[PDB]
Design an enzyme around this catalytic site. Structure first.
Site, PDB file in Angstrom:
ATOM      1  N   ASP A  18      -5.362   9.801  11.926  1.00 53.92           N
ATOM      2  CA  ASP A  18      -5.670   9.023  10.730  1.00 53.92           C
ATOM      3  C   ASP A  18      -6.256   7.665  11.097  1.00 53.92           C
ATOM      4  O   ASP A  18      -5.989   6.659  10.438  1.00 53.92           O
ATOM      5  CB  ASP A  18      -4.421   8.845   9.864  1.00 53.92           C
ATOM      6  CG  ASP A  18      -4.755   8.431   8.444  1.00 53.92           C
ATOM      7  OD1 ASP A  18      -5.924   8.598   8.037  1.00 53.92           O
ATOM      8  OD2 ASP A  18      -3.849   7.951   7.731  1.00 53.92           O
ATOM      9  N   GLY A  40       4.392   7.980   2.313  1.00 58.35           N
ATOM     10  CA  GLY A  40       5.181   6.838   1.889  1.00 58.35           C
ATOM     11  C   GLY A  40       4.483   5.672   1.215  1.00 58.35           C
ATOM     12  O   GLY A  40       3.283   5.704   0.941  1.00 58.35           O
ATOM     13  N   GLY A  65       0.777  -1.225   0.000  1.00 62.12           N
ATOM     14  CA  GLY A  65       0.000   0.000   0.000  1.00 62.12           C
ATOM     15  C   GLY A  65       0.811   1.279   0.000  1.00 62.12           C
ATOM     16  O   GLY A  65       2.030   1.264   0.170  1.00 62.12           O
ATOM     17  N   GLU A  66       0.118   2.394  -0.202  1.00 60.01           N
ATOM     18  CA  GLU A  66       0.736   3.712  -0.144  1.00 60.01           C
ATOM     19  C   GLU A  66      -0.304   4.744   0.270  1.00 60.01           C
ATOM     20  O   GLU A  66      -1.503   4.542   0.076  1.00 60.01           O
ATOM     21  CB  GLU A  66       1.366   4.081  -1.489  1.00 60.01           C
ATOM     22  CG  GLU A  66       0.398   4.100  -2.662  1.00 60.01           C
ATOM     23  CD  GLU A  66       1.079   4.455  -3.971  1.00 60.01           C
ATOM     24  OE1 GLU A  66       0.390   4.493  -5.010  1.00 60.01           O
ATOM     25  OE2 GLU A  66       2.306   4.692  -3.959  1.00 60.01           O
TER      26      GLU A  66
END
Ligand SMILES: Cn1cc(Nc2nccc(N3C[C@H]4CC[C@@H](C3)N4C(=O)[C@@H]3CC3(F)F)n2)cn1
Length: 274
Positions: A122, A21, A16-17
């Site tokens: 987040d 990053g 993932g991204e």
């Protein structure tokens, strides 16, 4: 503190991204390695954070290595095999008891995070990882910040606005209670099994419409202050939804701490776990 040598590193695939990053699965044992694509200075902070965070419901730090191709370090972590709940839940029929167990564990993990005087910023299903059907972990801390010694709050298009409380979208302040608003949205995701058609972005945009130009957030802010909220997920128990709405208090001080929630989830879990 462990040092990984980028020579015994075999890239298996991408995992993932997001934001800063990218995360890839590597062979060494199998590890998940995160790399950085101002952002640079925070990256040093994030790594240190994860290095000093130790909890059964927080992804395990395992070391760093020489990211020759990008003037810094990569962050090596444990590979959580079943991925994130956003990945997993849509494909696997999970019971309410199980979902509430995940919820309780997220709170245990978040409670520990806050006691270390960190906000997350987040907290979403996409960032909760499944180790096994009875264990869940918080898998990313890209936005995590230390709360200023003498303050109760911390002061971008990449911001997960559909997971944020009004005081964030409005006063640009982030309280521990702000993470709790996020947890509430994360609880909602779980109860909807992370179905795309019911996601916060999708459902919130159905309410706001998409002819709102540069005013998506401003409209989002004022529907939240009219008391409007994400709908009740089908097959979601009445008291659970109430638990969601309590995390979604417009008044942040009216929101339960993660401390308060652990005892409550523990009880609602034992209930439906029968
Ligand atoms: C698809 N898949 C993933 C696994 N497991 C696994 N083990 C460790 C970390 C991890 N992460 C991917 C996701 C979820 C948390 C964070 C790390 N991720 C990110 O995308 C960060 C934003 C960013 F890329 F830096 N995922 C299995 N399949």
């Amino acid at each position: 503190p462990t040092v990984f040598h980028k020579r015994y590193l075999k890239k298996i695939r991408d995992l993932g991204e997001g934001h800063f990053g990218k995360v890839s699965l590597y062979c060494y044992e199998m590890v998940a390695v995160k790399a950085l694509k101002q952002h640079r200075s925070g990256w040093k902070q994030e790594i240190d954070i994860l290095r000093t965070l130790y909890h059964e419901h927080i992804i395990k730090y395992k070391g760093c290595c020489e990211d020759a191709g990008a003037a810094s370090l990569q962050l090596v972590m444990e590979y959580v095999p079943l991925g994130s709940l956003r990945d997993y839940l849509p494909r696997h029929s999970i019971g309410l008891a199980q979902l509430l167990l995940f919820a309780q564990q997220i709170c245990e993990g978040m409670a520990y995070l806050h006691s270390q005087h960190y906000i997350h910023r987040d907290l979403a299903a996409r960032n909760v990882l499944l180790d096994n059907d009875r264990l869940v972990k918080i898998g990313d801390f890209g936005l995590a910040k230390a709360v200023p010694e003498g303050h109760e709050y911390y002061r971008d298009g990449d911001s997960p606005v559909f997971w944020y409380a009004p005081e964030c979208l409005k006063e640009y302040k982030f309280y521990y209670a702000s993470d709790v608003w996020s947890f509430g949205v994360t609880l909602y995701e779980l109860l909807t099994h992370c179905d795309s058609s019911q996601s916060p972005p999708t459902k919130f945009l159905e309410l706001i419409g998409i002819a709102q130009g540069q005013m998506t957030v401003l409209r989002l802010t004022e529907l939240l202050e009219r008391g409007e909220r994400l709908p009740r997920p089908d097959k979601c128990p009445a008291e659970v939804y109430h638990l969601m709405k309590n995390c979604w208090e417009t008044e942040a001080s009216f929101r339960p701490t993660f401390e308060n929630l652990i005892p409550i989830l523990k009880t609602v879990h034992e209930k439906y776990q029968g």
